[PDB]
Symmetry: D2
Subunit: 295 residues, 4 copies
Amino acid sequence: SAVKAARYGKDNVRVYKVHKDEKTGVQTVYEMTVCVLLEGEIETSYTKADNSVIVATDSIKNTIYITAKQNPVTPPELFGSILGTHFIEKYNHIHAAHVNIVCHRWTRMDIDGKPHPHSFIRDSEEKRNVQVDVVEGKGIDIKSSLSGLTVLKSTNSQFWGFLRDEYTTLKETWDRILSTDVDATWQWKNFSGLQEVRSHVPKFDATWATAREVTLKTFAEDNSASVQATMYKMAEQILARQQLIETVEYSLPNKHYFEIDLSWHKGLQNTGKNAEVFAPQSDPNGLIKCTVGRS
Amino acid sequence: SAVKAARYGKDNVRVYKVHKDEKTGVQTVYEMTVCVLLEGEIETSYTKADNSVIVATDSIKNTIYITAKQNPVTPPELFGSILGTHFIEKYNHIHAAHVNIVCHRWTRMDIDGKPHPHSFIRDSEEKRNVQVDVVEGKGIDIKSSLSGLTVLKSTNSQFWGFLRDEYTTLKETWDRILSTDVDATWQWKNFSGLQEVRSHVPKFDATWATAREVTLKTFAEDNSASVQATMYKMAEQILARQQLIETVEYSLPNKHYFEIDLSWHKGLQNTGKNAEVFAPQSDPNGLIKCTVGRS
Amino acid sequence: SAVKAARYGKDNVRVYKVHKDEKTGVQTVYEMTVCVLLEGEIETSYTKADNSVIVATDSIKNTIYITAKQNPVTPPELFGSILGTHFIEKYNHIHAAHVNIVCHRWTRMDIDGKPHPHSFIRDSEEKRNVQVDVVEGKGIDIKSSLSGLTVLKSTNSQFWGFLRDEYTTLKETWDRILSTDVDATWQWKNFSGLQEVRSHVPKFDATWATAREVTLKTFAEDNSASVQATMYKMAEQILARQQLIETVEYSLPNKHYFEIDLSWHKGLQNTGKNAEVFAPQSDPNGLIKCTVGRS
Amino acid sequence: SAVKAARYGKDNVRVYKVHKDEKTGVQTVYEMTVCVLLEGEIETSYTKADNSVIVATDSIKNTIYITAKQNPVTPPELFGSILGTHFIEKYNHIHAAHVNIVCHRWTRMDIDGKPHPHSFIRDSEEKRNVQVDVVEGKGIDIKSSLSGLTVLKSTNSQFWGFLRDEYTTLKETWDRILSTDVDATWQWKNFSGLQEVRSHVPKFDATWATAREVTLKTFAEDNSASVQATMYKMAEQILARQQLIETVEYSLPNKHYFEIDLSWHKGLQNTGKNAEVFAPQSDPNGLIKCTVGRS
Ligand SMILES: O=c1[nH]c(=O)c2[nH]c(=O)[nH]c2[nH]1
Ligand SMILES: O=c1[nH]c(=O)c2[nH]c(=O)[nH]c2[nH]1
Ligand SMILES: O=c1[nH]c(=O)c2[nH]c(=O)[nH]c2[nH]1
Ligand SMILES: O=c1[nH]c(=O)c2[nH]c(=O)[nH]c2[nH]1
Ligand code: NA
Ligand code: NA
Ligand code: NA
Ligand code: NA
């Protein structure tokens, strides 16, 4: 036997950073969960108990905090690129660094209609994420995403015209609820290294904003023929709006809301046009995925 | 042996309701998780296999949906009171109904700066809850609450002057982070029945709004001497603002953010006044509780 | 306004302890999650920013570790009693200590059919818990419990003879699945203090063993008329077997497994007597509770 | 823009099946969570609202239940292969089926030392899983795994000799706790189709048993130089014991248990050789991965 692949490091490293403006008193906070996994010439740590090649995961943890102290932690695409570059540059025998960052929301509070200088609210579990793969001699591959964006529309979703055979019981519908948890990823063209990433820094926040805007507006406004068709429209527009993106991925559950037939009780009418009370279903759920690239 | 207490019913009943305005096209959604547990002369179902006294929990489930079809589901204090009253009135041998409702957020989307008529976003896992105890001959006892309201302030929290003895290692501080998950409950004076609850319907939404407003503003503005002192100020104000409340309860974790001493690395200064990067601690956590009544 | 109730302390304190036998090499591990909340003359910490009365929760944490170092952590009823007694004895102004302990399973591994001296497996998320309330001048009140014990029986559960009215759709059945998560609590007669608790130490492990044995055997062997009737039989027997228990509480969800009618597909028969494939339902669920005392 | 990849189906489909022996009365239960995602000529459902190419996910759900009714659900490798083969054979335009199965534990109860014929206990959240990828013209690729196997050893783990530089604070140790959650995957050589899978049916349960046995024994007996070195030994042995496996993957967190220095309190000695009470750390955690193939 032989090692075919190996990567190791520290997961679930929680990180907070504050920025304080001396002149204005305005503080700004960032909170993240970081994972760094390293690859390189480390196979003998597995096969020969040779720990000399191990950069201890405890030290990877320390390095995450130190890097956050000495560099901007925003946008996360930049921070991850700086962090991953560090490991491959500092250690000759380490040839890739895999940096995953989950950014947690801390939105500034409005109190009596004015922004407060140092108080924040977690306005949802929606996350902004990056996957930054820094590979020696092969640049920096970045995937950016938003996840946990939970939405519902109460009409203007349809699903009819699907295949019907001996396995089919679902009725066609021209008016249903659609609810999902949006997982949307935009994959950047390869960067040659940290310099190139830095040359594009403003595009990271702007493209996240575009992705979120397009997601929400398309969801709200598309009289949806299916989850498939709606998600494709989102992907199309994001590609049109940022040429440095190569592909857009969506992964969307269809979180079903079932009608409840109550006609058995006093002839109560709660289906079709008269549907007002529904049963949200925890499981099962449709799962719809696609990756959209340029023609 | 003998039954000293008994209650039974259906938990985790998920409920959605939509309201559609024919004239304007504007739809409004509500989503809840409901639990109903009944008490009464049911001890023989436990001791003598006498199921004749059981209102099947499946039927309790049906009744929840039917009640939601035939009545407003907002404010949840009203809906729970209607639902609980039903069981004690319909079944001679049922003498109490315990109704717990968790309301989930579906906030109307703003698209290109205008409210959308049928699309919604879950802007956090913060919940609005009620516990409605309907007891035959003893009226309706309601506890209202908000929970899962997660906040952080990056300065203007202190903790000094606490007891110090041979078990103490914590350093006094005049500037720390404070973060919590707010669980705040306001307990209504007893209502004699459904009529009295109905006479106060507008006060339920208004008092929830007050509780949330007071929580956030006091958290943001109090240069906090401790969690104890800050939460008490919140409770005080809520009691002052709604005379039909008898008590206010807060349950607040102190979700610690620890400084990280990095001076071991190149003499990096990241403590005290120079603290910028912190380690959020998942556990343990302080837990601070109080119930405030009127003097 | 005035403080009507107050308690504060440290939650989610994770604790491991190892015992090593020098003579045999056999090591034994214990792992717990501890919560300690204190009451006493502490109201001025809430109303007057008077932190002098606060035993810092950080110090409560330290004390938990120190107490675990200097005393047995098993049985948890004893450990909690020692810990709670400490706070009320050490601090004149603290008059109650509320100690909650969740014990996590670490079962010794059997390797090639012999017990291993220092390797363990978590053979489920089933917990053994205590709630120890140490109240100055009022002794020690202990509730012991097992929770997260998940079981299923595939036949010999029935449910028929329940009330039927205009809200009822459930069919009577003489053969169904029953699955639950057992939450069982036994409440000890008040102890006057730590000495009395110590006088009964062997009864704590034995009564937990009895409770678990009775639960499992009664679940397996009772041709159940309902959840109500089966749980009562468990409670009865536990009371019969330990006179120092005053009451037994069960809280049992009915985790439904629904038949699936497949006759629409090639006339496939999968109901009643021919039922083989079922749909486990995540929600809703029945919830059945009772407290049983002595006649 | 254009679809570069697409797959869709039903996730979180809960399935129970019972087998009843008429002659002996002995019943046996299986419970799973199933996900099926399909690929094929379905791009027009995304780009042209062409639902005619969609096998509705609701129908995929039905098919899962029907397949479970008409076939053995054990071993899960076989069931998944039957299920995936169905979709690619039944639908000309569907060319791959991705079947993920999580098997939940229902272990027969022993009551008064004899196996009970129809009562079961969930003896942990450890899962047995399969990922079965059925690809038209490319056979059946199966990955089998065990996950959620949580273990601890209280000594005979070491970690010394690792790289030390200006980022390192971790002390070398010759005696520490090691605890992990085992995620172990064995990847089968490609099968040409369902016939070939069937020809190997007994090897699936046997190889899972071997993987679990080797994991536990190696964990218990290896005086571990590191997580890396121990996991490699497990992988080596599994490959040696089943020639139809091509690779073995392990993914192991190092769930840290920290010493607690209590010498500040009455000179209490709880480190090194005197370490008895530790603080389990929820986060961060090491994460160690490798894929082992044959030389
Ligand atoms: O938008 C949908 N897409 C599907 O593929 C599908 N399948 C299904 O059952 N309902 C839906 N809805
Ligand atoms: O506000 C606080 N209250 C306490 O009771 C306490 N105890 C502690 O350790 N830190 C804090 N902070
Ligand atoms: O054992 C049961 N008890 C009930 O109270 C009940 N109600 C119900 O719908 N099914 C069951 N089953
Ligand atoms: O077995 C270990 N491997 C590592 O890579 C590592 N890194 C670390 O900090 N502790 C450990 N332990
Ligand atoms: Na390198
Ligand atoms: Na009544
Ligand atoms: Na005292
Ligand atoms: Na095909």
